[PDB]
């Protein structure tokens, strides 16, 4: 099951109905359980899938920095995030949507905060609008990513005003 | 708020109508259910013929004599043919 | 009954056109 999901990640497309039915069987079997109906599905598939996607996206994030600069790394990460939102929508139970896309972010955008912040000063100063858009839509989800961008934007606005007025 | 047991020979059908409802509506109901034109089947009340004009309120089916807990009986005849409704099974004797 | 039979033509546009096609 993880191999077919990874094959979907690699570019191919497995039988969506078969994978979705097999995954949803883990939660349909214990529909009669009054206490924690998803306890079976979470322990059997959701936890191994979270571990597998964490490993895969850690490897992918490490494999995207070594050849791509920070300008289009953001576009590639956002494309991977959208493709993960789509591929976790047609395969997984609706409960395990905000967790997988969490474990994606904490492997692609959070774990390289010190990288993205290191280019934030260059993003704001040159005023690359698409790059600020990618900046904001990336670091908003991360807990401790937004305030550094806020501080950098405040500093850039203050310096721009000083240059425009003090002369 | 009137409830009727429209009875064929063996077929019995339980229909809810209004007090001020004409024979037109129930005739179309029986037509749509038994798949039979109403120009060829005409209903009976306790061996007494009814037409397609009068309403159920003054026909004899009041809201008290045709309550759902004991609906009134309405005959039928399919093609003339006499009212030959087969009565229900004989209830067992009290032990 | 289904949607496909229940879809109507541009009757509202025709109704709007009734203002302009009045005799």
């Amino acid at each position: 099951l993880l191999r077919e999901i990874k094959n979907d990640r690699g570019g191919e497309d497995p039988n969506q109905k078969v994978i979705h039915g097999v995954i949803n069987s883990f939660v349909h079997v214990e529909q009669y359980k009054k206490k924690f109906p998803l306890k079976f599905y979470q322990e059997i598939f959701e936890s191994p899938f979270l571990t597998e996607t964490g490993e895969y996206y850690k490897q992918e994030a490490s494999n995207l920095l070594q050849e791509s600069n920070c300008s289009q790394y953001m576009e590639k990460v956002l494309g991977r995030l959208k493709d993960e939102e789509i591929r976790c929508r047609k395969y997984l139970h609706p409960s395990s949507y905000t967790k997988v896309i969490h474990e994606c972010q904490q492997r692609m955008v959070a774990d390289h905060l010190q990288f993205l912040h290191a280019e934030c000063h260059n993003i704001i100063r040159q005023e690359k609008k698409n790059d600020m858009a990618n900046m904001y839509v990336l670091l908003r989800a991360v807990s401790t990513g937004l305030p550094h961008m806020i501080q950098e934007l405040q500093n850039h606005i203050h310096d721009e005003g000083l240059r425009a007025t003090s002369n | 708020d009137v409830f009727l047991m429209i009875r064929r020979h063996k077929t019995t059908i339980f229909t809810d109508a209004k007090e001020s409802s004409t024979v037109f509506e129930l005739k179309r109901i029986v037509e749509g259910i038994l798949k039979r034109p109403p120009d060829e089947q005409r209903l009976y009340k306790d061996d007494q013929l009814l037409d397609d004009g009068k309403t159920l309120g003054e026909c004899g089916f009041t809201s008290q004599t045709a309550r759902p807990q004991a609906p009134a009986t309405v005959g039928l005849a399919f093609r003339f043919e006499a009212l030959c409704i087969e009565p229900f099974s004989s209830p067992p004797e009290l032990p | 009954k289904k949607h496909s039979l229940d879809l109507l033509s541009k009757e509202r546009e025709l109704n709007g056109k009734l203002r302009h096609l009045s005799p």
Partner: protein, 627 residues
Amino acid sequence: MEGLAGYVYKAASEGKVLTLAALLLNRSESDIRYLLGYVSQQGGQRSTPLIIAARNGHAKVVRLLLEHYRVQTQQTGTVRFDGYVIDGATALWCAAGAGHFEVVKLLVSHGANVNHTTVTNSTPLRAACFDGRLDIVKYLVENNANISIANKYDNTCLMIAAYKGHTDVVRYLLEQRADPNAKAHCGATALHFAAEAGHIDIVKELIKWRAAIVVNGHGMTPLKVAAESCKADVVELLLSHADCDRRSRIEALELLGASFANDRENYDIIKTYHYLYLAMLERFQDGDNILEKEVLPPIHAYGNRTECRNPQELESIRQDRDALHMEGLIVRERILGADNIDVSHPIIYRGAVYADNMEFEQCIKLWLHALHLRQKGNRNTHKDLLRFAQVFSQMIHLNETVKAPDIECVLRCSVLEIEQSMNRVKNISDADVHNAMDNYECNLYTFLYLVCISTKTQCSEEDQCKINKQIYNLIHLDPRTREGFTLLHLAVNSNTPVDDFHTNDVCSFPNALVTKLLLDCGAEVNAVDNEGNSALHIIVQYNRPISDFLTLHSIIISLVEAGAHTDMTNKQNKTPLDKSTTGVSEILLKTQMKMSLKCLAARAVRANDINYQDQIPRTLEEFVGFH
């Protein structure tokens, strides 16, 4: 006195000459004028006896009334129905519009106004050509009937005559020096309506008259709407006019093929392929002046097809019907610019067709594209919202999961459409106010069905946040129906009209989940109707407290916990306990009711009618106001 006049009008309507002569016998000049000229009301029509005689074709009645009693030919009244509420009409207009030549002859020979203008600048010639009688039109023209006279939207007799399929009258009007370049309200000409009606003879006579083919106000040349109206016969005749150049005729052929691709009554594959292939050959024949289409980018709703530039590309999709339909839709809105009125109908029909074989995802995608097109076109779209609600209820009832982004997009379009309905009915006129209010109420009901569907399905936290954001936006907009119902009152009323097609099997009002979602979205709880009833006064009158106890209990719990006054009074001074018809709701509310000295003191203040103006805080003033 009115009985004799009413009897005269009834006899004139029924054409009883003997009765009319008996009633008009031994009557003075004033009596004759009152009996013949009084405008009687019957059957929703306010008309004179002469008008109703001419409309019914009573030549004997009209000649008896005109020869001896010399009744004036300047009567006014309300004539016709079905969108025709035209006033100021004379008997000649009705006689010409009813196809009775003898009545027209008698009226004109008696002195009828041939150039009579009704309220909407309508001449009897226009009605006569609407009916389709050559003799009436000819005879009226012989009495100085100006064909150039039109309505307030500038629709002359030739245009309305060309709307219908009558060759004789349009040929006579073209012989009668009619204007072939007459401009309608939206810059339209008679050739437009001749082409869209599929009348080959009228179109060929108009182009014989040098119709001066030109686009309308929107910008659609009549050959384009001929292609749109799914009529190949009228399309395949402008080639010989030697004025279509090459681009106009080829886009006409492409649009005709696209219209044949997807329509309710003109749906076929083989001729669509034939005409598309012919158009592509005509584009790709000379090579020196070869035409290259402006290929629009592939929208994700319309699959992943980037047109067909190569002949092999068109050949490879000739055997597949769905690809042909999708390409036809794409080229259709490419020619039409995706901003025209005639764009939404084919895509909506194709969405229904995709819904035929339970292909719900494709139906949702196609109709979402349709809804976005309607919204960008600023077109009223309440029926589309209704059919989204119907499909969502159908696919919920068949146990098949609803895509949360789909229902989120439909809810966004729903709140936008409700805002549009609000600012439309804000400045609407008296003519269309009833249908504007009905559309507003229908939009509110569709929003409620959509919220019920969203509660029925399960989604992730972000999708639920988006849905709640849309609901909170609509709540902050604060909608109201005609009778003062807010969204909460409708959500708790069992009398809220749910649609009977598929929503009735899922959307059941009152519903606990929609009310809970609204209250979590900051719905005002203590809102009142025009009758003063709050949400509590509406829920306590629930007629099913036993078989549907969970919903009623949850509604009462949510209303009390969100903050509601269990003893607030309406305009008739009825507490929710008083309005509670069922005792079950009475004691549910009593279990939720908490005794407060503020309520008792406010009740005492209201009952004793002691003046509380400026004697209490501003909040306490309204608090006593609704106690």
